[PDB]
A paper describes a structure:
G protein-coupled receptors (GPCRs) are highly dynamic and versatile signalling molecules that mediate second messenger responses within the cell. Binding of an extracellular agonist causes conformational changes in the receptor, triggering activation of signalling partners such as G proteins or arrestin molecules on the intracellular side of the membrane. Constitutive (basal) activity is defined as ligand independent activity, resulting in the production of a second messenger in the absence of an agonist. While the pharmacological and pathological properties of constitutively active receptors have been studied extensively, the structural basis of constitutive activity remains largely unexplored.
[name]-EL contains the wild-type residues E1663.49 and L3106.37, but also has the F358A7.42 mutation, in addition to A86L1.54, G215AECL2, and V360A7.44 found in [name]-ELF. For the structure determination of [name]-EL-T4L, we obtained well-diffracting crystals using the chimeric T4 [name] (T4L, cysteine-free bacteriophage T4 [name] with C54T, C97A) approach, where most of intracellular loop (ICL) 3 is replaced by T4L. In particular, TM5 shows an outward placement away from the receptor core when comparing the V2685.69 Cα atom distances of [name]-EL and [name]-ELF (3.9 Å). TM6 displays an even further outward position when comparing the V3006.27 Cα atoms (7.4 Å). As found with other constitutively active GPCRs, NTS-induced activation of G protein is reduced in [name]-EL, in contrast to [name]-ELF and the wild-type receptor ([name]-WT).
Author numbering:
A (entry chain A): 43 to 91, 100 to 268, 1002 to 1165, 297 to 372
B (entry chain B): 8 to 13
Write the structure that this text describes.
């Protein structure tokens, strides 16, 4: 009415958020937009010049698109001027489509980034030969393609709507879901589960598995470098064979030139019968996963290996390294004792075996490891290598913590929007929801500035 | 009054 009143009967759409909080959120938003712009750009710019950056570069793009596309509009029509929507029906359908499609791309990348890491650390014989530049290329194109398909429902759920008390007005046009609560409910759930819960489970599970493998590699390194011995020259095995390094069986052929011949199909130089320390650990890392694979494809060794902690797994690998998959699987009562976590019982029975009599000094160190779950029988260890272990664990935790700290309140807010029915919305829940809106999204935007810092420390 | 901003 009036045609002379601009702010008409739109009182039911008003939001009572203070201008002081608006100033604070805008300042917080300006800080996040500045850091996130440079951080994601520098990561994206320096990339254009080991395919683990293709995922990092993909993540660096999606975080930047969130700051450039969704942040300005939200700062105007969702923070400062809640109504009316100043971008039309096409803008209403387009904004919520892109904001969700890019949110998927970030969440799916964060998951896919840790998937490649899991395939790089926990499985060295399935990735070194199977991943190509072409596979990783299209794998990322599928991430963006699936993210755009999952955001298609937003083109139908959202839309322009006039909620002014007057039949017609301009100040009543709002960008709100144009479907019933049941349809809004289903759309928000599938969105919430797919992005939030799929990564959160995939991120936290795979990262926990990565932390154990890295701890095993730190434990198995010193245990075998002490018992098996590190020798940079060719020496004769106890059984009369040619070995080198950390017990790298070269060949059973008695020809020394043939042993020198095979000694460098893996090393890559001519050497003339000598290798370096860094080369020995490369042969060691290959010989370790071979023992790990035989343990995993064995049904008599895997249940024991799974129930053991990181330290006791190294003791098992220590035994598999010396005797083989069959020789260790010959132990059948002790493995069941190790499976029941009866350490003192298993420690005594192994002291009866032939393997304990052949190498008494080493067997006690392996047995003592099964007793205490610590490597104290091998000393304190190398502090330089063991600290890099502690670094990577906290980084894996940071990736999990940042994803939940930044995106849990965001999805929780949208659940409030559709699950609190009409009868439960008091005046306080309305004002809280809009103050709650500022906090959840500032945390959501923070991931666009935090990720270029975390994932560039990996 | 349910909110309209998602």
């Amino acid at each position: 009415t009036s045609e002379s009143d601009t702010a008409g009967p739109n009182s039911d759409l008003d939001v009572n958020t203070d201008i002081y909080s608006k100033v604070l959120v805008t300042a917080i938003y300006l800080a996040l937009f500045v850091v996130g712009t440079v951080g994601n750009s520098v990561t994206l710019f320096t990339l254009a010049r080991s395919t683990v950056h293709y995922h990092l570069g993909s993540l660096a793009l999606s975080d930047l698109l969130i700051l450039l596309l969704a942040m300005p509009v939200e700062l105007y029509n969702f923070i400062w001027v809640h109504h009316p929507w100043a971008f039309g029906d096409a803008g209403c359908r387009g904004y919520y489509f892109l904001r969700d499609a890019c949110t998927y791309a970030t969440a799916l990348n964060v998951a896919s980034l840790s998937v490649e890491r899991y395939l790089a650390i926990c499985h060295p014989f399935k990735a070194k030969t199977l991943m190509s530049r072409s596979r990783t290329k299209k794998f990322i194109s599928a991430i963006w393609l699936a993210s755009a398909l999952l955001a298609i429902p937003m083109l139908f759920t959202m839309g322009l709507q006039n909620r002014s008390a007057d039949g017609t007005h301009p100040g009543g046009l709002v960008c709100t879901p144009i479907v019933d609560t049941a349809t809004v409910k289903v759309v928000i759930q599938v969105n919430t589960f797919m992005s939030f819960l799929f990564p959160m489970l995939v991120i936290s599970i795979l990262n926990t598995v990565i932390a154990n493998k890295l701890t095993v590699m730190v434990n198995i390194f010193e245990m075998l470098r002490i018992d098996e011995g590190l020798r940079l020259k060719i020496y004769k095995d106890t059984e009369g064979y040619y070995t080198i390094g950390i017990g790298h069986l070269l060949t059973k052929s008695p020809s020394l030139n043939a042993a020198k011949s095979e000694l460098d199909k893996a090393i890559g130089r001519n050497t003339n019968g000598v290798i370096t320390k860094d080369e020995a650990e490369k042969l060691f890392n290959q010989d370790v996963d071979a023992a790990v694979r035989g343990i995993l494809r064995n049904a008599k060794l895997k249940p024991v290996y799974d129930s053991l902690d990181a330290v006791r797994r190294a003791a098992l690998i220590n035994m598999v390294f010396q005797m083989g998959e069959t020789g260790v699987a010959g132990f059948t009562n002790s493995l069941r004792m190790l499976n029941n976590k009866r350490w003192d019982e298993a420690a005594v029975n192994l002291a009866k075996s032939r393997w304990y009599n052949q190498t008494p000094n080493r067997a006690k160190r392996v047995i003592t490891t099964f007793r205490t779950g610590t490597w104290d029988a091998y000393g304190s260890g190398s502090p330089g290598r063991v600290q890099a272990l502690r670094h990577g664990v906290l980084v894996l935790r940071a990736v999990v913590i940042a994803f939940v700290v930044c995106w849990l309140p965001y999805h929780v807010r949208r659940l409030m929007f559709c699950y609190i029915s009409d009868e439960q919305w008091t005046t306080f829940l309305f004002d809280f929801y809009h103050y709650f809106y500022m906090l959840t999204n500032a945390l959501a935007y923070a991931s666009s500035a935090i990720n270029p810092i975390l994932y560039n420390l990996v | 009054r349910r909110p309209y901003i998602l």
